Amino acid sequence: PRKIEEIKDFLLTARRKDAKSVKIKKNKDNVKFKVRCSRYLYTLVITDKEKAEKLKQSLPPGKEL
Amino acid sequence: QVLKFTLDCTHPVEDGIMDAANFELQERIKVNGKGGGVVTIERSKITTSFSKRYLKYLTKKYLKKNNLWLRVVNSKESYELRYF
Amino acid sequence: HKTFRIKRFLAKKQKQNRPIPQWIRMKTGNKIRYNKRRHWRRTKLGL
RNA sequence: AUGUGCUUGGCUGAGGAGCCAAUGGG
RNA sequence: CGUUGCCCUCGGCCGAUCGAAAGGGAGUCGGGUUCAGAUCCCCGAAUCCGGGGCGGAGAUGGCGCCGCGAGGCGUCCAGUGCGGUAACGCGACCGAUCCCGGAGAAGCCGGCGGGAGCCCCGGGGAGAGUUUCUUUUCUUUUGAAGGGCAGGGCGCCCUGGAAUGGGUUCGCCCCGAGAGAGGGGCCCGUGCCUUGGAAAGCGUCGCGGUCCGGCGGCGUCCGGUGAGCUCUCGCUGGCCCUUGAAAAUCCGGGGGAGAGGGUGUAAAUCUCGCGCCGGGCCGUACCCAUAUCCGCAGCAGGUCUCCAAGGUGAACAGCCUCUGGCAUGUUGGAACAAUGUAGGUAAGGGAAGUCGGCAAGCCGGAUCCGUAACUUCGGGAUAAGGAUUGGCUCUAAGGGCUGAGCAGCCGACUUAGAACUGGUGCGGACCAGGGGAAUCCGACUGUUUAAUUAAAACA
RNA sequence: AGGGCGAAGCCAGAGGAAACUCUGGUGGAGGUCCGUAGCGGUCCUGACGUGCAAAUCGGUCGUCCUGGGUAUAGGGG
């Protein structure tokens, strides 16, 4: 797996052709967005709920755990 | 700073197999081995200070004392008596 | 740990350890009455 | 009399009571 | 780049080939699933090897017309990376035949240290047991790979210079070929954190039962200690007239033939980050041993390994227990004669027995005293001989963190000295050397007639 | 396994005019010792001797090796 530290890097990863899915995991403390790509699963960790919702809104057009 | 435990007894009291009048603990609860107003009992369900499993041990001791068909189990800081 | 040849030998020896079909007892010139049976403990394979 | 004491190690939460150690030992 | 002959050219012998399911040899782990298979099935997360995309790297720089434009033109000239004093570092960072080197690739034993698994101690939960006492007793309480940071190591670098020599280990060791001190670098990081990853697993309590990786709640929490056992990683010693594989295979370096493009890039990537495709063949059940193998058998025999907890105790001893397992080893019942096989005891005597103290009984552990002849000076030697040993209650001593010596908090076990106390019992079972004075032979340790001779024989 | 003895080397202390000696500690050698596992097989001339067994069993004992591969074949090894 790979851990992404920035929102823009996550957005670039999620727009890759080989990206297959994105899964959202609501944890007590944080939220995790996980993008399934060809080689690695990429995880972004967000501690702000409002920022999490904003990122959820801006996703490529093409599931929650 | 203050620890509270309930230890409800509704089911055996309602069926009349035991009264909630002999249980309310005051003469058996040990504080520092042998404790003043350090801990308190608020009978009603009961209730303040400590180990909760000490309360479970005392409840099972009381059940054995009165030949009580009953089981001590309900939520955090809360024990409940229920039938098998 | 087996080789292919040993395993094939064992498979052939396994397929030969069955009783005769009953209907063969009804043939016109039948002299057989039962099966060259082999037991893994009583008789050992040629290996 | 495995009768009754004593005693080692272990075991039954402790005790009271006992058991195991091809007859525990005395 | 599938094309033929030639030179401008190079290409030595370990000559084919076989030889290890324990040696060498890249790369897979977690969870779930069956009546019987799973590191192989499914879910998920990776990885190695082999075979024509995108990004990044190659890297936008330096007379003079307008311009104090950082504007583009006009021309010429550069550019096969950069940083650190250094050890070395950074995403990558051309290059053949050839040459040098490294790794693969090294014994046995000792001591010490780090890491982990297990064990142990004190608390917090969940369930269970007991119920005169016991806030008690038992059970239970994150993979590979990647990225950080610990802690372990370094004959690695820089400054500087040492005697009143210093540093230092359990031991040693080290130093003007450079110590101590200070500041750095590299390697290993199986340890912690994090992505994985809680969604799964487990525990407990409930709800839907047709099916059900069914749906839910709560939880999966804090510390401490060690000559402890097992594994591992290091460091430093000892022993050898013993010096403890080879090859496949993989890599670095030296050198420089060459290639690349002309001012916007081109050749090229120890090959840097992603992306694409593929990994055929054979084995895989189970037993593995008081009935799955060999011994004619479901034979008290033989047959290579890995893991292994609590108590006692020096202990992988013996004895008792937990996890796990079993049904007493080709039967059962009644009785308890002789003779037997295997154990126990025996008054008084104490080898009178016998070829012969045969066997079996005396001794036995620790602690404190004491120990002869003789000797190759190493020994003999636990020589011989004597005392003690329980339980309980104390005293004294033996460590780590806090501001020639004072106050707190933490901490594991010993040793010694006492008092009291038992119908003198106390290494209470288990475990566990009888001794001395001589002769003969062989120096010793070692070996030997599998199945009658272990010896003085052989070496 | 766990223990005993305890060599070389090393540290300190004491004695002595000196030469040097002594004492304590440290250290951990050895075809060393007691003794597990393993290997072996002394005695009971025990058991058994139509055996569990064409050589095994129990106490008592000695010491503290082993798988696989490969080579040597009968007057030969």
Short mmCIF file of N, CA and C (backbone and C1' of nucleotides) in Angstrom, two decimals, chain E residues 235-285:
data_model
loop_
_atom_site.label_atom_id
_atom_site.label_comp_id
_atom_site.label_asym_id
_atom_site.label_seq_id
_atom_site.Cartn_x
_atom_site.Cartn_y
_atom_site.Cartn_z
P C E 235 30.07 -8.00 14.45
"O5'" C E 235 30.95 -7.62 15.72
"C5'" C E 235 30.69 -6.42 16.43
"C4'" C E 235 31.11 -6.54 17.86
"C3'" C E 235 32.41 -7.28 18.11
"O3'" C E 235 33.55 -6.47 17.87
"C1'" C E 235 30.78 -8.02 19.64
P U E 236 34.88 -7.09 17.22
"O5'" U E 236 35.60 -7.80 18.45
"C5'" U E 236 35.78 -7.12 19.68
"C4'" U E 236 36.03 -8.09 20.80
"C3'" U E 236 37.05 -9.18 20.52
"O3'" U E 236 38.38 -8.73 20.64
"C1'" U E 236 35.13 -10.13 21.53
P G E 237 39.60 -9.67 20.19
"O5'" G E 237 39.76 -10.69 21.39
"C5'" G E 237 40.26 -12.00 21.18
"C4'" G E 237 39.93 -12.91 22.34
"C3'" G E 237 40.42 -14.34 22.20
"O3'" G E 237 41.77 -14.48 22.57
"C1'" G E 237 38.15 -14.36 22.81
P G E 238 42.81 -15.22 21.60
"O5'" G E 238 42.72 -16.74 22.05
"C5'" G E 238 42.68 -17.09 23.42
"C4'" G E 238 42.00 -18.41 23.63
"C3'" G E 238 42.51 -19.56 22.78
"O3'" G E 238 43.67 -20.16 23.33
"C1'" G E 238 40.15 -19.52 22.73
P C E 239 44.77 -20.81 22.37
"O5'" C E 239 44.05 -22.07 21.75
"C5'" C E 239 43.68 -23.19 22.55
"C4'" C E 239 43.20 -24.33 21.68
"C3'" C E 239 44.05 -24.61 20.46
"O3'" C E 239 45.16 -25.44 20.78
"C1'" C E 239 41.77 -24.54 19.84
P C E 240 46.57 -25.19 20.07
"O5'" C E 240 46.41 -25.92 18.67
"C5'" C E 240 46.10 -27.29 18.60
"C4'" C E 240 45.62 -27.68 17.23
"C3'" C E 240 46.44 -27.17 16.06
"O3'" C E 240 47.59 -27.98 15.82
"C1'" C E 240 44.11 -26.95 15.62
P C E 241 49.00 -27.67 16.52
"O5'" C E 241 50.07 -28.27 15.51
"C5'" C E 241 50.37 -27.61 14.29
"C4'" C E 241 50.45 -28.55 13.11
"C3'" C E 241 49.34 -29.60 13.01
"O3'" C E 241 48.97 -29.77 11.65
"C1'" C E 241 51.44 -30.67 13.01
P U E 242 47.63 -29.11 11.08
"O5'" U E 242 46.78 -30.34 10.53
"C5'" U E 242 45.85 -31.01 11.36
"C4'" U E 242 44.45 -30.91 10.81
"C3'" U E 242 44.01 -29.50 10.44
"O3'" U E 242 43.06 -29.57 9.38
"C1'" U E 242 42.61 -30.33 12.14
P U E 243 43.44 -29.05 7.91
"O5'" U E 243 42.85 -27.57 7.87
"C5'" U E 243 41.46 -27.34 8.07
"C4'" U E 243 41.13 -25.88 8.10
"C3'" U E 243 41.77 -25.03 7.01
"O3'" U E 243 40.85 -24.01 6.61
"C1'" U E 243 42.40 -24.19 9.13
P G E 244 40.30 -23.96 5.11
"O5'" G E 244 38.84 -24.59 5.20
"C5'" G E 244 38.62 -25.99 5.05
"C4'" G E 244 37.48 -26.44 5.93
"C3'" G E 244 36.29 -25.49 5.98
"O3'" G E 244 35.34 -25.78 4.98
"C1'" G E 244 37.00 -25.99 8.19
P A E 245 34.82 -24.64 3.97
"O5'" A E 245 35.57 -24.97 2.61
"C5'" A E 245 35.12 -24.45 1.37
"C4'" A E 245 35.05 -25.54 0.33
"C3'" A E 245 34.67 -25.10 -1.07
"O3'" A E 245 35.79 -24.61 -1.80
"C1'" A E 245 33.43 -27.02 -0.47
P A E 246 35.68 -23.28 -2.67
"O5'" A E 246 35.14 -23.77 -4.08
"C5'" A E 246 35.80 -24.80 -4.80
"C4'" A E 246 34.84 -25.50 -5.73
"C3'" A E 246 34.04 -24.60 -6.65
"O3'" A E 246 34.75 -24.24 -7.83
"C1'" A E 246 32.59 -26.14 -5.61
P A E 247 34.62 -22.76 -8.44
"O5'" A E 247 33.29 -22.82 -9.31
"C5'" A E 247 33.17 -23.71 -10.41
"C4'" A E 247 31.73 -24.06 -10.69
"C3'" A E 247 30.81 -22.88 -10.98
"O3'" A E 247 30.88 -22.44 -12.32
"C1'" A E 247 29.80 -24.27 -9.37
P A E 248 30.48 -20.93 -12.69
"O5'" A E 248 28.90 -20.97 -12.82
"C5'" A E 248 28.25 -21.85 -13.73
"C4'" A E 248 26.81 -22.08 -13.34
"C3'" A E 248 25.93 -20.84 -13.33
"O3'" A E 248 25.43 -20.52 -14.62
"C1'" A E 248 25.62 -22.05 -11.32
P U E 249 25.61 -19.05 -15.25
"O5'" U E 249 24.72 -18.00 -14.45
"C5'" U E 249 23.44 -18.40 -13.90
"C4'" U E 249 23.21 -17.63 -12.62
"C3'" U E 249 23.62 -16.16 -12.65
"O3'" U E 249 22.65 -15.35 -13.29
"C1'" U E 249 24.28 -17.16 -10.60
P C E 250 23.06 -13.99 -14.03
"O5'" C E 250 23.25 -12.92 -12.86
"C5'" C E 250 22.12 -12.53 -12.07
"C4'" C E 250 22.64 -11.83 -10.84
"C3'" C E 250 23.56 -10.64 -11.10
"O3'" C E 250 22.83 -9.50 -11.54
"C1'" C E 250 24.46 -11.95 -9.39
P C E 251 23.52 -8.42 -12.50
"O5'" C E 251 24.45 -7.60 -11.50
"C5'" C E 251 23.83 -6.77 -10.50
"C4'" C E 251 24.89 -6.33 -9.52
"C3'" C E 251 25.95 -5.39 -10.09
"O3'" C E 251 25.46 -4.06 -10.17
"C1'" C E 251 26.98 -7.08 -8.78
P G E 252 26.07 -2.97 -11.19
"O5'" G E 252 27.39 -2.52 -10.43
"C5'" G E 252 27.32 -1.85 -9.18
"C4'" G E 252 28.68 -1.75 -8.53
"C3'" G E 252 29.77 -1.07 -9.34
"O3'" G E 252 29.69 0.34 -9.33
"C1'" G E 252 30.62 -3.07 -8.44
P G E 253 30.08 1.19 -10.64
"O5'" G E 253 31.66 1.14 -10.68
"C5'" G E 253 32.44 1.72 -9.64
"C4'" G E 253 33.81 1.09 -9.57
"C3'" G E 253 34.77 1.43 -10.70
"O3'" G E 253 35.41 2.67 -10.50
"C1'" G E 253 34.80 -0.90 -10.30
P G E 254 35.67 3.67 -11.73
"O5'" G E 254 36.96 3.08 -12.45
"C5'" G E 254 38.22 3.03 -11.79
"C4'" G E 254 39.22 2.28 -12.63
"C3'" G E 254 39.39 2.77 -14.06
"O3'" G E 254 40.31 3.84 -14.16
"C1'" G E 254 39.14 0.41 -14.04
P G E 255 40.04 5.08 -15.14
"O5'" G E 255 40.27 4.48 -16.59
"C5'" G E 255 41.53 3.93 -16.97
"C4'" G E 255 41.40 3.15 -18.26
"C3'" G E 255 40.69 3.88 -19.38
"O3'" G E 255 41.58 4.68 -20.14
"C1'" G E 255 39.76 1.71 -19.12
P G E 256 41.21 6.20 -20.51
"O5'" G E 256 40.55 6.09 -21.95
"C5'" G E 256 41.19 5.35 -22.98
"C4'" G E 256 40.19 4.61 -23.82
"C3'" G E 256 39.11 5.46 -24.47
"O3'" G E 256 39.55 6.02 -25.70
"C1'" G E 256 38.10 3.65 -23.34
P A E 257 38.53 6.67 -26.76
"O5'" A E 257 38.10 5.45 -27.69
"C5'" A E 257 39.07 4.78 -28.49
"C4'" A E 257 38.49 3.54 -29.13
"C3'" A E 257 37.37 3.77 -30.13
"O3'" A E 257 37.84 4.12 -31.41
"C1'" A E 257 36.76 2.04 -28.63
P G E 258 36.96 5.08 -32.35
"O5'" G E 258 35.52 4.39 -32.36
"C5'" G E 258 34.35 5.13 -32.65
"C4'" G E 258 33.14 4.53 -31.99
"C3'" G E 258 31.88 5.37 -32.02
"O3'" G E 258 31.17 5.23 -33.24
"C1'" G E 258 32.21 4.49 -29.85
P A E 259 30.65 6.52 -34.03
"O5'" A E 259 29.22 6.81 -33.40
"C5'" A E 259 28.24 5.78 -33.29
"C4'" A E 259 27.17 6.16 -32.30
"C3'" A E 259 26.66 7.59 -32.42
"O3'" A E 259 25.63 7.69 -33.38
"C1'" A E 259 27.19 7.11 -30.16
P G E 260 25.41 9.06 -34.19
"O5'" G E 260 24.78 10.04 -33.11
"C5'" G E 260 23.53 9.76 -32.50
"C4'" G E 260 23.18 10.84 -31.51
"C3'" G E 260 23.47 12.26 -31.97
"O3'" G E 260 22.44 12.79 -32.77
"C1'" G E 260 24.35 11.95 -29.80
P G E 261 22.73 13.23 -34.28
"O5'" G E 261 22.17 14.72 -34.34
"C5'" G E 261 20.94 15.05 -33.73
"C4'" G E 261 21.07 16.27 -32.86
"C3'" G E 261 21.91 17.40 -33.41
"O3'" G E 261 21.21 18.20 -34.36
"C1'" G E 261 22.46 17.04 -31.14
P G E 262 21.70 18.26 -35.89
"O5'" G E 262 22.60 19.58 -35.96
"C5'" G E 262 22.00 20.85 -36.14
"C4'" G E 262 21.90 21.61 -34.84
"C3'" G E 262 22.75 22.87 -34.73
"O3'" G E 262 22.15 23.98 -35.41
"C1'" G E 262 23.04 21.54 -32.79
P U E 263 21.93 25.43 -34.74
"O5'" U E 263 20.82 25.17 -33.63
"C5'" U E 263 20.18 26.26 -32.96
"C4'" U E 263 19.47 25.79 -31.72
"C3'" U E 263 18.97 26.89 -30.80
"O3'" U E 263 17.80 26.45 -30.12
"C1'" U E 263 20.57 25.59 -29.66
P G E 264 16.44 27.31 -30.19
"O5'" G E 264 15.31 26.28 -29.78
"C5'" G E 264 14.63 25.50 -30.76
"C4'" G E 264 14.54 24.05 -30.38
"C3'" G E 264 13.97 23.76 -28.98
"O3'" G E 264 13.24 22.52 -29.04
"C1'" G E 264 16.07 22.78 -29.17
P U E 265 12.48 21.92 -27.75
"O5'" U E 265 13.62 21.16 -26.94
"C5'" U E 265 13.78 19.74 -27.03
"C4'" U E 265 14.86 19.36 -28.02
"C3'" U E 265 15.29 17.90 -28.00
"O3'" U E 265 14.39 17.06 -28.69
"C1'" U E 265 17.19 19.33 -28.19
P A E 266 14.23 15.53 -28.25
"O5'" A E 266 15.55 14.82 -28.80
"C5'" A E 266 15.75 14.64 -30.19
"C4'" A E 266 17.08 13.97 -30.46
"C3'" A E 266 17.37 12.74 -29.63
"O3'" A E 266 16.76 11.57 -30.14
"C1'" A E 266 19.24 14.17 -29.56
P A E 267 16.34 10.39 -29.13
"O5'" A E 267 17.69 9.58 -28.90
"C5'" A E 267 18.39 9.02 -30.00
"C4'" A E 267 19.84 8.77 -29.67
"C3'" A E 267 20.11 7.80 -28.54
"O3'" A E 267 19.99 6.44 -28.92
"C1'" A E 267 21.46 9.71 -28.28
P A E 268 19.13 5.42 -28.03
"O5'" A E 268 19.72 5.57 -26.56
"C5'" A E 268 21.07 5.24 -26.29
"C4'" A E 268 21.44 5.52 -24.85
"C3'" A E 268 20.58 4.86 -23.79
"O3'" A E 268 20.89 3.50 -23.62
"C1'" A E 268 21.04 7.11 -23.19
P U E 269 19.92 2.56 -22.75
"O5'" U E 269 20.39 2.81 -21.25
"C5'" U E 269 19.45 3.17 -20.25
"C4'" U E 269 20.01 4.20 -19.30
"C3'" U E 269 19.67 3.93 -17.85
"O3'" U E 269 20.71 4.44 -17.01
"C1'" U E 269 18.63 5.94 -18.55
P C E 270 22.06 3.59 -16.77
"O5'" C E 270 21.88 2.95 -15.32
"C5'" C E 270 22.82 3.22 -14.28
"C4'" C E 270 23.42 1.95 -13.73
"C3'" C E 270 22.42 0.81 -13.52
"O3'" C E 270 22.96 -0.45 -13.90
"C1'" C E 270 23.54 1.29 -11.49
P U E 271 21.97 -1.70 -14.13
"O5'" U E 271 20.59 -1.03 -14.57
"C5'" U E 271 19.50 -0.89 -13.66
"C4'" U E 271 18.97 0.53 -13.69
"C3'" U E 271 17.47 0.70 -13.51
"O3'" U E 271 17.10 0.78 -12.14
"C1'" U E 271 18.21 1.94 -15.40
P C E 272 15.59 1.17 -11.71
"O5'" C E 272 15.54 2.76 -11.77
"C5'" C E 272 15.97 3.55 -10.68
"C4'" C E 272 15.08 4.75 -10.45
"C3'" C E 272 13.59 4.51 -10.48
"O3'" C E 272 13.10 3.94 -9.28
"C1'" C E 272 14.09 6.46 -11.72
P G E 273 11.79 3.02 -9.29
"O5'" G E 273 10.60 4.06 -9.49
"C5'" G E 273 10.32 5.05 -8.51
"C4'" G E 273 9.05 5.79 -8.84
"C3'" G E 273 7.88 4.91 -9.26
"O3'" G E 273 7.20 4.35 -8.16
"C1'" G E 273 8.10 6.71 -10.77
P C E 274 6.27 3.06 -8.36
"O5'" C E 274 4.94 3.66 -9.00
"C5'" C E 274 4.19 2.90 -9.93
"C4'" C E 274 3.42 3.78 -10.88
"C3'" C E 274 2.62 3.05 -11.94
"O3'" C E 274 1.39 2.54 -11.46
"C1'" C E 274 3.84 4.78 -12.96
P G E 275 1.06 0.98 -11.62
"O5'" G E 275 0.60 0.84 -13.13
"C5'" G E 275 -0.37 1.72 -13.67
"C4'" G E 275 -0.33 1.74 -15.18
"C3'" G E 275 -0.32 0.38 -15.86
"O3'" G E 275 -1.60 -0.21 -15.91
"C1'" G E 275 1.29 1.78 -16.87
P C E 276 -1.77 -1.80 -15.71
"O5'" C E 276 -1.36 -2.41 -17.12
"C5'" C E 276 -1.99 -1.97 -18.31
"C4'" C E 276 -1.41 -2.67 -19.52
"C3'" C E 276 -1.22 -4.17 -19.38
"O3'" C E 276 -2.41 -4.90 -19.57
"C1'" C E 276 0.72 -3.20 -20.34
P C E 277 -2.73 -6.17 -18.65
"O5'" C E 277 -1.92 -7.36 -19.34
"C5'" C E 277 -2.18 -7.73 -20.68
"C4'" C E 277 -1.10 -8.62 -21.23
"C3'" C E 277 -0.79 -9.87 -20.42
"O3'" C E 277 -1.71 -10.92 -20.64
"C1'" C E 277 1.22 -8.80 -21.05
P G E 278 -2.04 -11.96 -19.47
"O5'" G E 278 -0.76 -12.90 -19.40
"C5'" G E 278 -0.48 -13.83 -20.43
"C4'" G E 278 0.89 -14.44 -20.29
"C3'" G E 278 1.13 -15.27 -19.04
"O3'" G E 278 0.63 -16.59 -19.15
"C1'" G E 278 2.95 -13.80 -19.39
P G E 279 0.09 -17.36 -17.84
"O5'" G E 279 1.42 -17.89 -17.14
"C5'" G E 279 2.21 -18.90 -17.74
"C4'" G E 279 3.56 -19.00 -17.07
"C3'" G E 279 3.55 -19.38 -15.59
"O3'" G E 279 3.49 -20.78 -15.38
"C1'" G E 279 4.97 -17.51 -15.93
P G E 280 2.10 -21.58 -15.42
"O5'" G E 280 1.91 -21.92 -16.96
"C5'" G E 280 1.21 -23.08 -17.37
"C4'" G E 280 1.95 -23.82 -18.45
"C3'" G E 280 2.35 -25.25 -18.11
"O3'" G E 280 1.29 -26.17 -18.26
"C1'" G E 280 4.19 -24.12 -19.07
P C E 281 0.86 -27.12 -17.04
"O5'" C E 281 1.98 -28.24 -17.02
"C5'" C E 281 2.33 -28.95 -18.20
"C4'" C E 281 3.53 -29.82 -17.94
"C3'" C E 281 3.47 -30.61 -16.65
"O3'" C E 281 2.73 -31.81 -16.79
"C1'" C E 281 5.57 -29.56 -16.84
P C E 282 1.61 -32.20 -15.71
"O5'" C E 282 2.42 -32.99 -14.59
"C5'" C E 282 3.24 -34.09 -14.93
"C4'" C E 282 4.24 -34.37 -13.84
"C3'" C E 282 3.69 -34.34 -12.43
"O3'" C E 282 2.98 -35.51 -12.07
"C1'" C E 282 5.70 -33.12 -12.50
P G E 283 1.76 -35.40 -11.04
"O5'" G E 283 2.47 -35.26 -9.62
"C5'" G E 283 3.36 -36.25 -9.14
"C4'" G E 283 3.94 -35.86 -7.81
"C3'" G E 283 2.94 -35.44 -6.75
"O3'" G E 283 2.37 -36.55 -6.08
"C1'" G E 283 4.73 -33.89 -6.81
P U E 284 0.81 -36.60 -5.74
"O5'" U E 284 0.66 -35.60 -4.51
"C5'" U E 284 1.53 -35.71 -3.38
"C4'" U E 284 1.46 -34.48 -2.51
"C3'" U E 284 0.08 -34.17 -1.94
"O3'" U E 284 0.21 -33.69 -0.61
"C1'" U E 284 0.87 -32.32 -3.16
P A E 285 -0.13 -34.66 0.62
"O5'" A E 285 -1.62 -35.13 0.34
"C5'" A E 285 -2.71 -34.24 0.42
"C4'" A E 285 -3.98 -34.98 0.71
"C3'" A E 285 -3.99 -35.73 2.03
"O3'" A E 285 -4.41 -34.92 3.11
"C1'" A E 285 -4.64 -37.19 0.29
#
